[PDB]
Amino acid sequence: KGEELFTGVVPILVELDGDVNGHKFSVSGEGEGDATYGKLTLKFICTTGKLPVPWPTLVTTFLQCFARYPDHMKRHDFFKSAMPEGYVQERTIFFKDDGNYKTRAEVKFEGDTLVNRIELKGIDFKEDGNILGHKLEYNYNSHNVYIMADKQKNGIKVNFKIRHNIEDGSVQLADHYQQNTPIGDGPVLLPDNHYLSYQSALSKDPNEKRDHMVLLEFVTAAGI
Helix, strand or coil: CHHHHHCCEEEEEEEEEEEECCEEEEEEEEEEEECCCCEEEEEEEECCCCCCCCHHHHCCCCCHHHCECCHHHHHHCHHHHCCCCCEEEEEEEEECCCCEEEEEEEEEEECCEEEEEEEEEEECCCCCCCCCCCCECCCCCCEEEEEEEECCCCEEEEEEEEEEEECCCCEEEEEEEEEEEECCCCCCCCCCCEEEEEEEEEECCCCCCCCEEEEEEEEEEECC
């Protein structure tokens, strides 16, 4: 049923409230998702001024239900199956040798719109680190996202490692521990082990005056 919801282009709305080391901020985003192609196009705006952290560190935080699942893996799409009641996506992200982020997000439909409301708390960041120091490059590497069913919880467990390019030519690691649970009491698809393949491109809007980010993602399922 949830799958029917993604037959075409879907409008997305994103809302994030954050606090990193005491710095409070907010972001609003909007865009379109196309699961058929496994394509997402989003634009985010910091509405509280300048973003206290580098945009790139927020990419993973700012819609796995838009993954293109090939016809044969269709039975492993937990994400769409939870729709429209949606799911809760939680994470802890450990930045190597720096602090971590803790996020909680609800993804669901609110009308014809797919909504992603996030809460983020960041702690232990070093003032001189890559994060607070704004030393990341404005680009993004390609990564695989691993999925494993969690029968007991009736959800999934996810893990992956992000590599952030540093201006000095080094790499900054961000270890992602994630959990997804359904919001509703309906039945969901517990999948077999597989992964999502991501590709991303960051950019700016020449006529946009607020601190912002244009994000493009390509996601495709695999491993079955």
